[PDB]
Design a protein around this ligand. Structure first.
Ligand SMILES: Nc1ncnc2c1ncn2[C@@H]1O[C@H](COP(=O)(O)OP(=O)(O)O[C@H]2O[C@@H]([C@H](O)CO)[C@H](O)[C@@H](O)[C@H]2O)[C@@H](O)[C@H]1O
Ligand SMILES: Nc1ncnc2c1ncn2[C@@H]1O[C@H](COP(=O)(O)OP(=O)(O)O[C@H]2O[C@@H]([C@H](O)CO)[C@H](O)[C@@H](O)[C@H]2O)[C@@H](O)[C@H]1O
Ligand SMILES: Nc1ncnc2c1ncn2[C@@H]1O[C@H](COP(=O)(O)OP(=O)(O)O[C@H]2O[C@@H]([C@H](O)CO)[C@H](O)[C@@H](O)[C@H]2O)[C@@H](O)[C@H]1O
Ligand SMILES: [Fe+3]
Ligand SMILES: [Fe+3]
Ligand SMILES: [Fe+3]
Lengths: 389, 390, 385
């Protein structure tokens, strides 16, 4: 929540602010308020108002220029341009869902390095415990306990559906959900991994592989019947130990329930993320869904085989071991003509409650994934961990 | 699966051919005749008709002691008056192309039918079931559907499930008496259930106490669709000092995106093995936890305690077992409901709550704590009063 | 019938009163409560709501090991958390001012319920049935509906037939499992049928071999509506050297113009006698030929062969007997069909064929020759083994 009263004091009891876009609160009189884009000198908004609130429709980063006129005056009573250097800036991520935070957060550091501001970021505690030690320049906090109280500017990074163009410059479906943060903060949009504590010594001596079979919605699962079984068996035949590191061993809704695959070691449970990083680091590689554990595995600098058909290859971070099939329905989430249902586990634009439901992922056979795994294995044996990454 | 002789097997005087395959049949040459079919036991006139030529068959196909009367138009007495008499005659009982549970349920009635009428009985079924049963039932001749040895049988009876409330090929709807007892009703014998006789001579292989489980079936309604059920049960079994083994034919089975896998923690004894090996493994098991699939019937026949988990069928639809798990607070017993109809082509069949939040709800309401409570009772019963407890 | 206490019998802490008569009841005083009802066996949350002062009852009335939880509307832990526990507690089982075969069929499940939970059980029924059963069941206290001796019972269960596919007072529709097994389902015990224990000590009075029959029924459907059935059967019985004796309560019974009388040739042992005398006569009988009426259940409990003639109910609707007579070529099982509904006010009830040519075809197809065939098998079985 933004402050009820704007944080900056202007002359003649006018209060201005940049917390939820560019805001300005006028007392009593007859005013003519003008919002400009300082970079392009375009007049973004302009109106005659007597008292009420005036906010910009755009909420993402824009170097706003606020002008407050008297209704007939030549020069401005107030004329303040956004300037963030050595100022209290608050970046608010939503209550934590991994992966999304790992994807977004590297854009928050770029925002701080660019504008040289005093930055505080609000997120769930576990992500703070994961990230905070490596980013000393940024102050971490939880949503319910923010330490700036009165911030100069606030920006709210998140996913905004329905083709929203007011809190984000472009629909995130067009540029990728994680880059979108870069666009919102107006920095270098190119993806990057977060910096983690990779100092933890190896525990398990034998070569082993980490896998993640669970996600938040069923579309993201690998809904091939014999997929995970064939993959795990093939991994074992190559001399790998296989370990599931999902948070839940069993997850699903109604009658559709997904369980940790037979043959995979049980490393599941609600553990602190640092332990997962430690285990993942010394793994030979990681085979995952588009869920967050794939982003965590990416940040630990190990090869990531990412199995997804419900999302396009360019929607997540790049990896040469991306598994994807293009002969059936695919990229259902990606399309801008469809809208994601938050209350439906089930929900297919084009085959829901039909014979072809979750075809996006069913066409991805074990043999395909095992073909990718064979390439990645030969790359690891012949060349080293240098060649992949 | 079964095709009656195109020409009736029994010869009647004036080139009339009569038969008791596919109900009571009679084929007349050309002429004028009045034909009557009677129930010899009740002396009721079942069918009255006038026909010049062609086929005359009874609408009822299940066992009835028929009495066929063929009359020349205007005659007082019958030309042919033959009543069904099965002693020392070729009788062919035809099961549907094989399934595991339905055959094990049905077949004991076939033996009663032979012991009652003292007839030469041949039964047609799939080969694996023949390999399982044949040695213990010497008096009955086993064959496959494509290679029947009795080319000209006196009477034929076709035991099976008949949906849509059929009352011509079965006396009662099988949903009213239980699918397996229906066979008894069709053959007109003692309908009370019984287990088949198996080869229980196999020596114990695994020394430690162990439990057999079956998680797979043909349609999703029969599965235990609780999220954490099988996991909690297997963990509880292990905590009691049991080894747990899955003996399903398939390790993975399902349709579309719905797929069921052998539960983590259970030993892999899956695969397409001969049934006799499954009998050998099941016999020395401490007890069995199963669905309403056939492996529960096979486990029942091996004289071990059977915990049967099902909500899509009523408790009285299968064989009796004190360890039957059932929940009556939600949807249940769709299978037994005579107002509904089973879909053979729909794997995700639940007629009343498909594609809703409450789909397969009745199965779900069966929690791991309920089944573990039954397992606790059965465990204490076994430790305290051994295997002599009924 | 029977009324539950207007105020729950068990005291809870903050003037909360809970109870297990008529399902799980709880009565809250004034305040702001959040009440949950759970199934202790499955740990499922059966019911859950926020209520200010009033009654909260479970929709299910049959036996469930309920668990009642009463919350403050913001509390973490329960103010009251009580699970059903019946050992050494006052439990009341109420049968209707019941019919004869229904009570004989049901009552064995009441004894199982007591032996399982080790409770102090009182059963309410009509006096004649009490006189019949009470001496053999000392562990259970018998009473009449109007004079119950447990004024404040811990749990109450009401065994009966509930039509219209009711699933709140009985777990399953009784047409699906059989009317008498339903009791077992209601009390959550072994549903398998059993005969009550009677006084079978009475000495033989009639020397010659004899047969007991019960012609009359309540509903015309249950009668043997074949024209010459009973006459042929009685004549055949006499030709086999049996004396034939009718033990129905009424010699004449029926409605409107449809009237049924004690068949000619059968001896008149009718009348409103105490059931114990009927038991005494039935015991030494060679066998019994009856309808689905109660006297067939009484004859069953006296451990004599029972030929049961019925078409309006399926063979599995009553107790098992190898001498069951049934015809499957016409209308049958008017009674077991879940798509139909029994009319208590209609004596001439057949839903599918009333006022047609085929009315009570259910039983008319059952000829005397059929029943005499069964009797011939049973007679040879008696003379030989
Ligand atoms: N404490 C933990 N300890 C150990 N493991 C844990 C822990 N917590 C979660 N997991 C595990 O990761 C998954 C959650 O993924 P998350 O919420 O972060 O994903 P979310 O669905 O919101 O979006 C996903 O879906 C992707 C999709 O492509 C968007 O269109 C997004 O790009 C990205 O945000 C990704 O996430 C869980 O299912 C667990 O298995
Ligand atoms: N060689 C084998 N070695 C080891 N296991 C084997 C072998 N072969 C099959 N199975 C396994 O048996 C089950 C399927 O058979 P099944 O006939 O039982 O089941 P189906 O789905 O057709 O429904 C059932 O439904 C039951 C009915 O619903 C009772 O309520 C029927 O009584 C039963 O006969 C059958 O109708 C699966 O679990 C197979 O992997
Ligand atoms: N004082 C007496 N002294 C001696 N005998 C007596 C005396 N009084 C009555 N009978 C005699 O028992 C019968 C009473 O009817 P009843 O309860 O039996 O039948 P009701 O129609 O209510 O339904 C019945 O329906 C039967 C049916 O088979 C269920 O589908 C049930 O099995 C049966 O338990 C009951 O449901 C009378 O018809 C008499 O002959
Ligand atoms: Fe899709
Ligand atoms: Fe259902
Ligand atoms: Fe009828």
């Amino acid at each position: 929540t933004p402050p009820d009263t704007p944080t900056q004091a202007g002359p003649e009891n006018i209060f201005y602010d940049f917390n939820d876009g560019a805001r300005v609160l006028l007392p009593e009189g007859k005013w003519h308020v003008r919002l400009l884009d300082a970079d392009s000198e375009n007049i973004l908004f302009c109106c005659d108002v007597d008292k009420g609130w005036v906010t910009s429709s755009k909420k993402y980063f824009v170097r706003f220029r606020i002008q407050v006129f008297r209704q007939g005056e030549e020069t401005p009573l107030l004329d303040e341009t956004l300037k963030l250097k050595d100022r209290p800036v608050l970046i608010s991520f939503p209550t934590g869902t991994l992966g999304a935070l790992l994807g977004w957060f590297p854009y928050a550091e770029r925002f701080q390095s660019l504008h040289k501001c005093r930055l505080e970021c609000t997120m769930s505690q576990d992500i703070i415990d994961l990230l905070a030690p490596q980013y000393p320049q940024i102050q971490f906090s939880t949503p319910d306990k923010p330490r700036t109280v009165a911030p100069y500017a606030t920006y709210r990074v998140g996913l905004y559906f329905g083709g929203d163009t007011n809190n984000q410059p472009v629909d995130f479906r067009k540029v990728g959900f994680h880059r979108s943060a870069g666009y919102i903060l107006g920095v270098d949009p190119r993806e990057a991994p977060v910096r983690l504590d990779l100092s933890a010594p190896r525990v398990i001596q034998e070569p082993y592989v980490c896998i993640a079979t669970q996600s938040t919605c069923q579309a993201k699962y690998w809904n091939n019947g014999t997929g995970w079984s064939e993959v795990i068996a093939h991994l074992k035949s190559l001399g790998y130990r296989v370990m599931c590191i999902d948070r839940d061993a069993h997850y699903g809704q109604g009658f559709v329930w997904n369980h940790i695959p037979w043959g995979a070691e049980d490393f599941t449970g609600k553990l602190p993320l640092q332990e997962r990083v430690n285990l993942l680091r010394h793994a030979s590689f990681f085979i995952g869904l588009p869920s967050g554990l794939s982003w965590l595995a990416w940040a630990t600098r190990i090869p990531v085989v990412l199995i997804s058909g419900f999302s396009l290859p360019n929607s997540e971070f790049y990896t040469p071991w991306r598994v994807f099939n293009s002969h059936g329905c695919y990229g259902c989430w990606d399309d801008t003509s469809l809208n994601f249902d938050h209350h439906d586990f089930l929900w297919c634009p084009r085959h829901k409650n039909t014979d072809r439901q979750f075809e996006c992922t069913r066409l991805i056979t074990g043999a395909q994934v095992n073909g990718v795994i064979n390439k990645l294995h030969r790359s690891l044996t012949e060349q080293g961990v240098e060649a992949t990454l």
